[PDB]
């Protein structure tokens, strides 16, 4: 309630920082005193933070982005704020289950990038002969079948670990490819239509370190 700045200016600064000046590589988190500093906003120094630490913890745990000044004092000089957590308002799940899949804003960017990249890769199968009843391809023909396509997709997924994905829990259960004739009842399937299911994880990064410091004295 006591925020001393025009609310929309801070929102505009945060959006501008998070949109273009930083996120041409989608895996970066806009946080900290270096990558999350709103250097274009200045406010007077104050001994009071606006939010108590317990309130900050509650806001963070309830899907709200919190921010604070870079330095503190009672003299009232100008300082810039920075973002503590770059988090979306996601909680629970479409099936009402609490999880952290979309907790970080970078997760959405990575999901969009993965969708686009997988769309681009699959274009090579557009208008390519497909064999589904007798899977032997005569000599000289340019074509493919289900198993070879799945092998190529597995290779692509494996080659992207460390760029778009963390290591797969079980590659044999995370990627599955099926044809329409296998799914739809008899006489209802369509030729050259496939179903693909893929499960992935985003890369992990350092988040927190809990330090226990135990001073002692020279002895013996």
């Amino acid at each position: 309630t006591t925020y001393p700045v025009l609310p929309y200016l801070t929102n505009a600064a945060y959006g501008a920082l998070s949109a273009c000046s930083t996120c041409e590589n989608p895996e970066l988190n806009v946080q900290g005193q270096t990558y999350g500093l709103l250097s274009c906003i200045n406010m007077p120094e104050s001994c009071t933070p606006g939010w108590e630490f317990t309130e900050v913890t509650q806001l963070q745990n309830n899907g709200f982005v919190v921010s604070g000044p870079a330095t503190t004092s009672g003299q009232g000089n100008f300082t810039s704020p920075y973002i503590y957590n770059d988090v979306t308002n996601y909680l629970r799940d479409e099936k009402n289950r609490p999880n952290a899949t979309f907790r970080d804003a970078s997760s959405r960017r990575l999901a969009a990038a993965t969708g686009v990249a997988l769309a681009t890769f699959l274009q090579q199968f557009n208008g390519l002969a497909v064999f589904t009843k007798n899977t032997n391809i005569k000599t000289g023909i340019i074509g493919t079948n289900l198993r070879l396509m799945l092998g190529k997709i597995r290779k692509w997924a494996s080659d992207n670990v460390g760029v778009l994905f963390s290591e797969f829990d079980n590659i044999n259960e995370d990627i599955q490819l099926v044809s329409d004739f296998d799914v739809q009842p008899k006489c209802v399937g369509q030729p050259g239509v496939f179903h693909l299911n893929m499960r992935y994880r985003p890369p992990v990064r350092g988040a927190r370190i809990n330090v226990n410091l135990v001073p002692a004295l020279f002895d013996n």
């Binding site: 900290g32 005193q33 933070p49 604070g68 370190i209 330090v211 135990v214 002692a216």
Partner: protein, 56 residues
């Protein structure tokens, strides 16, 4: 806020000179007489944490 080096919350610091890193070594039992002024329950095996809880 606190201090700039500790403000962002990445490092959460605890200073306590009474901590211990050692794990639990295997156990020893001591059996002996007590006096009427002791507050411990007779004929019950109980854990002892330091030299200073004694007497009472």
């Amino acid at each position: 806020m606190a201090q700039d080096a500790l403000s962002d919350g990445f490092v959460r610091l605890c200073i306590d000179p009474s901590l211990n890193f050692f794990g639990e070594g295997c156990k020893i039992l001591v059996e002996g007489q007590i006096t009427d002024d002791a507050t411990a329950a007779e004929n019950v095996v109980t854990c002892v944490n330091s030299e200073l809880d004694l007497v009472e």
